Amino acid sequence: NVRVVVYIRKDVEDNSQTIEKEGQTVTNNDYHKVYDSLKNMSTVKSVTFSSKEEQYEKLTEIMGDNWKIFEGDANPLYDAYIVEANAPNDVKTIAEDAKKIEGVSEVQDG
Numbered sequence: 001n002v003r004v005v006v007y008i009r010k011d012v013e014d015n016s017q018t019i020e021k022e023g024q025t026v027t028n029n030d031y032h033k034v035y036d037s038l039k040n041m042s043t044v045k046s047v048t049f050s051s052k053e054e055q056y057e058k059l060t061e062i063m064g065d066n067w068k069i070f071e072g073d074a075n076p077l078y079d080a081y082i083v084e085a086n087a088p089n090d091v092k093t094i095a096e097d098a099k100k101i102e103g104v105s106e107v108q109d110g
Contacts, residue, residue, distance in 0.1 A: 002045065002085035003110025006098040008034060010078050014102065015049040030102055037101045038083050043093060045084035052078050078105055 008014050014034040018025035038047040050058070055077045059067065070076050083098065085091040095107040 001088045002091050002094075004083040004085055004091050004094050004098070005050075005108045005110065006034070006038065006081035006083060006095075006101070006104055007077075007106040007108070008079035008081065009103040009105050010075065011052075012079060012103050012105075014079055015051075034081060034102045034104075038081050038098060041083070041094060041097060043086050043090050043097075045086055046082075047084075048082040050080040050082055052080075055080050 012030065013019050013028055014030045015032060017028055017031060019028045020026075035047055035049055038044060041047075052075060056068075059077065068074070068076065081098070083094055085094045091109045095109050098104050098107050
């Protein structure tokens with residue numbers, strides 16, 4: 001009952017490596033940075049990094065192939081961080097805290 005999801009910038013590649021920007025791919029200083037921040041949340045139970053590709057498959061699995069219609073290889077969803085709040089009343093605190101973590105695009109409370 002403490003399902004919290006933290007959306008990260010489009011292709012922030014927070015849980016990746018080497019980001020293509022400015023001058024080719026450059027080591028990502030945000031490597032596991034969001035994960036670590038969501039792990040030391042203190043009020044957190046567990047943190048799982050859900051890639052955008054996996055999120056799209058998961059979204060279609062929970063909904064179907066009649067919920068999306070952006071375009072071929074469209075990227076409406078980005079990286080997501082599944083965080084388990086200690087309590088159902090903490091999911092709100094976790095979301096408000098993750099909203100200030102690195103580049104959190106958005107947070108959705110399950």
